[PDB]
Structure formats: C-alpha cells, structure tokens
C-alpha cells in the first residue's frame, strides 16, 4: 500500500481534527463513490495522458468540511516518509460529498473530473493509487448502504475515523461485546484460472451482460463455512459442470465494487464436459493456449490490470 | 472430502425444500443459541476414547419445532455426498432447548469435532449467527424476510434501494482474517503472542481482520507491525480454516520478519515473544511454561508446518 493506515489514530479525535486543517493534509474527493481525477499535468502522466488522482488540500475542501452533516470523511492513513498535531506525519483523507457540492466543484476546477463508470475506469489508475481508491471507495460504499443497525433497525452514527458505525439504541445487543455489525464489510471472492486435464486449454466464461466476445475467469463469492479451495471447486462446478482437483493460490486484488477481495487461484480440472448454468453465466468454453496467446498479442479478455488477465497471462507462460 | 454437496441450485426450489422437510431420510442439526447438539461415543469410532459427534435428528425429533416457524430458523445445508439425503440446520430458542447435549463454549469445544463434521458446523453456525444479528435492512432499517433456503434476507420495503440490483446487504457475511506464523530473520525462532483474556501461559499466532482495500499479504504485514512492532517482508499463503465465531475465514500464512525488535501495543496484545524451534517442539509434544492452541486450530497447524 501507498500509505500507512495508522489505525491507532482512528480513535484519536483530537489528532484527526487537527490534521483536517493542516496544510500538508491530502484530500481525495469522491462524488457518488467516484474519485476526482485528472489527466496528465506532470512528467510521469505525460508521454501518453495518464489518469491520476486529483490531490486536494484543506483550502480546496474547507467549505465541505464545515458542513459535517453533509459529508462522509474517512481517514486513509499517513505517508510512508515523515516531513522535517505537528508530528511530521502527512495525513490522507477521503471526502465524500453531495451532488450539489460536486457540481459547484466541477465548475471551480476544470482540469479535474470524477472518474466513471468504475469498471473499467478504475483499472486506468496506477497500482499505488488504485489501492488507496479501493480503500476509500469500499469504506464510502459501506457507509452508503449500512446507515441502519442490522440487529435492530435503528439509526447509527459514524465513529473511529470512518471505520465504525454505532447504533443509537442504548439497549441494542450490537453494543454489548464486539460484533462485525459495527465494521466495514470485506467480501471474499475467488477467481480462478482453470486448466484442462491435458494442460493445453483453459476454461473461460461470460455473463450475458458482458460485451460481445469478452470471456474471463469464472469467479464466485466464498460462502460461510467454506475454504478458498472449497469455493473454487464449488463455483466452477456450479457454473460450468467442470470438476476441479488441485487449487493453488496466486495473488489478490481488492476490487471496490463495492467491497470485494478477489482471491486469484490456479486450478486443475479433473473433468472436461461442460454443462453451463444459464441462471449465472451465458457461456463457458475451453480455449487452447495458442488461442489465448493470440488474444494477449474471435474473443477478448479484460485489460491487463485486471486480476483475471494476470492469471491468464501467468498460465500462458507455465510449462504444459 | 466433504460431508455435503451444498446444492445451491436447490435453494430457490421451495417445493423441493418443503418436500425434504418431512422426508424420512432428512437429517436435522439442532442449534441452541448457536451451539450444536452433539453426542459422546456410541459407535466404533469411540472404542478407544469417547469422541464428540453431531447428534443427527430426523423429522419426528424436530416436528414440534417446525410447527412453530416463527420461533425457529431453518437453513438448508446440502445433501450427502430422488436418492438425495437432505441436511438442514434448525436454530431454536433456549426455552425449548438425554444422550445428547449442546456443545459449549464454542472456543475450544468446536475443535473437538472431526474435520468433516466441523465443516458442516462452520456453515450452519455462521449462517445462523448472521440471521441472529442481521434481521433489519442496513440500507433503510425495515424488517427483512428470509429467502433462498436461509441464504438471503430481503427488505420488506418495496421502494428500498436494496431491492434494485444485487447487493451484499442481502447475503451472509464472511469476514476474512489473516493468521500468520512469523519467522525471525535468522530462521530459528517464531513470533507468538497473547491477549490479556487468554488463559495464562497461552501463546498463539498473531492474527487480524483484512481491511477494505487491502491484500492478504498487506493485512499480514500491517497486523504484525500494529500488534508486535515487528516488520514483515515475504508472505506466503498456506491454508484456510473457516471459524464460525461468528463468520471468520482464517487465512493462514507463513511470513518472514525483516526486523527483530518487538514493541507490543499493550492494547490488543499484552505480550509477544520470539520462541525457538526447540521451545515449540517441546510444546507440541509435552514437557516449558507456555502452551499453544489444540491441534485442530489453524495456528497449531501453522506452527507444526514450520517446525517441519
Ligand atoms: N456479498 C455478496 N455481494 C453480492 N452478491 C452476492 C454476495 N454473496 C452472494 N451473492 C450472490 O452471488 C451472485 C453472484 O454469483 P457468484 O459471483 O458466482 O457467487 C450474486 O448475483 C448474488 O445473488
Ligand atoms: N468483522 C469484524 N468483526 C469483529 N471485529 C472486527 C471486525 N473488523 C474489525 N474489527 C475490529 O478488530 C478487532 C480485532 O483485532 P484484529 O483481530 O487483530 O484485527 C476487534 O476488536 C474489532 O475492534
Ligand atoms: Mg460466478
Ligand atoms: Mg456464488
Ligand atoms: Mg457462481
Ligand atoms: Mg489480532
Ligand atoms: Mg490486530
Ligand atoms: Mg485489526
Ligand atoms: Zn441496534
Ligand atoms: Zn430496506
């Protein structure tokens, strides 16, 4: 990650309040969960215009901050190097604002714009910036849909730097002991590059909503009581009929749509017959290594920053 | 291999689920306050020591509970691996709850179940626990209704945003947790810690929840450094263990420290130390003024994996 989350500061109201108006503090502005970005404008993002975060400071956002009931403020962390309250730490916050306010901003700064739609525009951000966006967007998305207490239905209030919501009903069981109802949600999702029993093909599928010709790795949410490997085997068989043996973890990608942790795996199929569950996917097929090589250089796959692309590209290079 | 095929394709088949409720081969697992009904001994597996196993009930054992649907919670677990033997979990109230008994307390008594039965309890307990604490719509606060064999809750307010599109507010929660065996730079020691609440002498792997926006490996590095001050480099995934307290997925990793100095937070972790392979070997066998979780806990499996 690009920041140190400094979760120990989340219950330090005085420190958080002081940092809000400190001149070194960085703000990332969000409207309807979309981050404010800019194209080009420095050396790295120049040779072809690259999308980068529009980093704001207190003088840019002070008017939003002075209406706390209309904003959602999340402490993201501090920069990894300290500069020469006044502790040398450079704080970052995510600031979610109302649409009226965002319009008045868009007329104020012409070079910055809100990134949308989230898929695939978030894949345009460089890795370090994409990670902080995934943190900020996932927490703001949680706040947008978890305003009421799941245990009793009452209103809740934000606490702990944006990382906790607390029911206002004093008698509520959610307030006795520690419960996940207080805290942001992380949904684990397995996504799997599935290799044919003969090592020369891989299994890819699509949903009816996908652009014509796009195919990608099968994926699904891990269920309660399931391991990573269990979910890979179950989801592949559900959607495509294919039975899976060995499952190998490869890498992760946080995917803030709203709050998914993509757990990327390589899996070896032990059967070949395909039986598509139309209620989930429209199509699943075996693609030869040669076909996939042709496409990485009559179907196509997600862009290179998507984990599915990284899994497919990794496989193309493995020893058959 | 597993006890059950989840057959999630059946969860929206209300006619099939209903037919199975009274079928003579259907098995029910009874839960009181999220604790499973179990039994000790009584088959070939206990010829040596009495072993805990699930107390499998059938329709005539639970039919009085089913006659009061507003007082129970019913979850379709799957079919054994139409000839299909359906399993359900049935959560009841403490009042309604002599060779069976409710397994309590969950830590460490759940660790007495054999792995294949532990997997079914983790499924059932976590879904039941979700229903206990997620009865209202997080998006608007209205009441909700159970659907899909116990795997969905649906807001009763027709205009609610939760009903336009697909949203995680409808579905069971799974909380990813990293737990990590952390090896000293010199390769000869591992880092273990404890909380004040722990029984005296107990040490275990550090662990913590993955945050929004974070990878497995970054959560390991962040939590180790938060809790113990130790900085971590390489992180390797090893294996998982679902832990239904209420709904955690323990993601077990081996990590290499790149610093040596410990600095404990004295808020979550009251103590953390480097333990040599010899100290740990002694404690996996039996001799040391400390001890670790039992063998079915993923921390014990990770510590064992490390010593070879
Ligand atoms: N946490 C969640 N967020 C969104 N959808 C979920 C979640 N858990 C289960 N689902 C269901 O999972 C479906 C997607 O299938 P899959 O991604 O293959 O598991 C969605 O259409 C939902 O019905
Ligand atoms: N899903 C969750 N369930 C319970 N506690 C959580 C959750 N997410 C964050 N927390 C917090 O994490 C603390 C435990 O620390 P750790 O397990 O080391 O991350 C709890 O006491 C809560 O304050
Ligand atoms: Mg899927
Ligand atoms: Mg699924
Ligand atoms: Mg699926
Ligand atoms: Mg911890
Ligand atoms: Mg911790
Ligand atoms: Mg933590
Ligand atoms: Zn409440
Ligand atoms: Zn609602």
User: Where in chain B are the domains?
Assistant: 1-172, 173-308
CA of A212 to the centre of ligand 3 (A): 18
Contact residues on chain A for B123, CB-CB shorter than 8 A? 223-226
Closest to B136 (Cβ–Cβ): which among A150, A180, A259?
Answer: A150
- Count CB-CB contacts under 10 A for residue B295: 10
What residues have CB less than 8 Å from A296, skipping those under 6 apart? A312, A313, A316
Q: Do residues A52 and A14 touch, judged by C-beta distance below 8 A?
A: no
Residue recorded with tokens 């009181």 = B32
Query: Rounded to the nearest 5°, which phi and psi values hold at A104?
Result: -65, -25
Cβ–Cβ gap B142/A153 under 8 Å: yes
DSSP letters, A54-78, are: --B-HHHHHHHHT-GGG-EEEEEEE
Question: Could you give the 3-state DSSP secondary structure of residue B227?
Answer: helix
Axis crossing angle, helix A289-296 with helix A307-317, rounded to the nearest 10: 120
Ligand 2 binding pocket, CB closer than 6 Å: A 178, 180, 183; B 175, 207-209, 223, 268
Cα of B275 vs its chain's centroid, Å: 27
Contact residues on chain B for A136, CB-CB shorter than 8 A? 213
Cα of B173 vs its chain's centroid, Å: 12
Number of CB pairs, chain A paired with chain B, less than 8 A apart: 164
Nearest partner of B178 among B239, B259, B262, B107, judged by Cα: B239
DSSP letters, A77-101, are: EEESS-----SS--EEEEEEE-HHH
Q: Do residues A130 and A305 touch, judged by C-beta distance below 8 A?
A: yes
Residue recorded with tokens 């799941």 = A150
Enumerate the β-bridge partners of residue A148. A155
Contact residues on chain B for A147, CB-CB shorter than 8 A? 138-139, 141
The shares of helix, strand and coil residues in chain B, as percent rounded to the nearest 5, are 30, 30, 40
Element (H, E) at A250: strand A244-255
Assess A138–B contact: CB distance below 8 Å, yes or no. Answer: yes
| Mutation target vs A (from B138, B151, B162, B247; most A CBs, 10 A cutoff) | B138
Contact residues on chain A for B148, CB-CB shorter than 8 A? none
Cα of A52 vs its chain's centroid, Å: 16
Experimental technique used? X-ray
Assess A32–B contact: CB distance below 8 Å, yes or no. Answer: no
Per DSSP (E only), the strands in B69-114 are 73-80, 86-92, 100-102
Given resolution (angstroms)? 1.6
**Which residues crowd ion ligand 8, with CB under 5 Å?**
B 208-209
Cβ–Cβ gap B138/A152 under 8 Å: no
Closest to A134 (Cβ–Cβ): which among B120, B213, B251?
Answer: B213
Query: Rounded to the nearest 5°, which phi and psi values hold at A102?
Result: -70, -35
How far is the C-alpha of B303 from the C-alpha of B83, rounded, in Å? 43
Enumerate the β-bridge partners of residue A31. A34, A97
Is B207 annotated to bind a ligand? Reply is yes
Q: Do residues A306 and A289 touch, judged by C-beta distance below 8 A?
A: no
Nearest partner of A35 among A105, A113, A90, judged by Cα: A113
Cβ–Cβ gap A277/B139 under 8 Å: no
Longest CA pairwise span in chain B (Å): 65
Helices (runs of H) and strands (runs of E) counted in chain A:
8, 15
Closest to A181 (Cβ–Cβ): which among B133, B162, B168?
Answer: B133
Query: Rounded to the nearest 5°, which phi and psi values hold at B169?
Result: -60, -20
> Considering every ligand atom, which ligand is closest to the CA of A187?
1
Is B227 annotated to bind a ligand? Reply is yes
* Alpha-carbon torsion (B221, B210, A175, B31), positive or negative: negative
Q: Do residues A242 and A269 touch, judged by C-beta distance below 8 A?
A: yes
> Considering every ligand atom, which ligand is closest to the CA of A168?
9
Question: Could you give the 3-state DSSP secondary structure of residue A226?
Answer: coil
Residue of the CA atom closest to atom 14 of ligand 1: A220
């Amino acid at each position: 990650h690009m920041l140190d989350r400094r979760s120990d500061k989340r219950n330090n109201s005085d420190w958080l309040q002081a940092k809000e108006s400190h001149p070194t503090t960085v703000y990332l502005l969000f409207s309807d969960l979309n981050p404010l970005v800019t194209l080009g404008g420095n050396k790295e993002s120049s040779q072809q215009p690259e999308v980068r975060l529009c980093q704001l400071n207190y003088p840019d956002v002070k008017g939003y901050l002075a209406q706390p009931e209309k904003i959602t403020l999340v402490f993201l962390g501090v920069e990894l190097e300290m500069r020469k309250a006044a502790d040398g730490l450079v704080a970052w916050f995510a600031l979610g604002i109302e649409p009226g306010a965002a319009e008045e901003f868009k007329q104020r700064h012409e070079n910055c714009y809100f990134l949308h739609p989230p898929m695939p525009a978030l894949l345009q951000l460089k890795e370090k910036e994409a990670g902080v966006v995934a943190q900020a967007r996932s927490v703001l998305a949680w706040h947008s849909r978890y305003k009421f207490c799941p245990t009793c239905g009452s209103a809740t209030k934000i606490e702990e730097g944006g990382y906790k919501r607390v029911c206002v009903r004093e008698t509520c069981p959610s307030l006795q002991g520690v419960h996940n109802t207080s805290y942001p949600r992380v949904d684990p999702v397995v996504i799997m590059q599935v290799i044919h029993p003969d090592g020369t093909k891989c299994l890819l599928g699509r949903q009816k909503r996908f652009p014509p010709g796009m195919f990608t790795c099968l994926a699904g949410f891990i269920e309660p009581g399931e391991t990573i490997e269990d979910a890979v085997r179950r989801e592949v068989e559900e959607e495509s009929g294919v039975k899976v043996g060995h499952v190998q973890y490869v890498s992760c990608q946080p995917w803030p749509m709203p709050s998914s942790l993509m757990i990327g795996c390589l899996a070896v199929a032990v059967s070949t017959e395909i039986k598509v569950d139309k209620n989930e996917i429209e199509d699943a097929r075996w693609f030869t290594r040669e076909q996939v090589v042709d496409v990485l250089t009559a179907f196509f796959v997600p862009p290179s920053r998507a984990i599915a692309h990284q899994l497919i590209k990794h496989w193309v290079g493995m020893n058959p």
